[PDB]
Amino acid sequence: KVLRDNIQGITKPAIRRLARRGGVKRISGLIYEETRGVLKVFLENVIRDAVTYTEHAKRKTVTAMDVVYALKRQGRTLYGFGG
Template identity: 80%
Template structure:
């Protein structure tokens, strides 16, 4: 499903590390009862993983 989302967004190749990060982002989006991933979802998910 993550690969399908990326393809829809125009991504051709996907790093293996992306999957875990994307799961965190989707968790934030689903919790907010939204279907659109926002940039803040990404920021919060990465911050939670200690990446920024």
Template identity: 75%
Template structure:
């Protein structure tokens, strides 16, 4: 036998043994902030307005019982309202040759739609 051929068993490469610690996920130890968390990818941002959030708004408005189809209808109306508001606020921003939408732009857009909001300056 030559010196390059030794009689040692072949070494197998194994995956590292997972630690049994509290933060053993893909995020590593995570430092002070904790491990990284990746939520579900939302297909549409309007789905972020969840059923319980809509239910809380309804309770605040005095509604007791809510139909199952009401949630989708509410999301549609909310999306339309926010789209119109953003377009109006953006028009005010572009007219004043700015790239940042200010609070006053949103307030003027709300006033234009007939929903005056007080308490935010101006």
């Protein structure tokens, strides 16, 4: 199923609100075309590593431990969902 224009779903306040959690007061208007780029790099290195686990067990559902196993691979461990 194909639904495009959804890198533009990461809206303009929801990058500002993520900026405020990092402790950032004033931002530019050109981070919005940088953040959407660095985000899709990070999801093209997790979903590419997650699907090769789900294809390997011949599952059609990328389950909760799969993503945690992908994040185990990169060296960014996620607790709380298992694994």
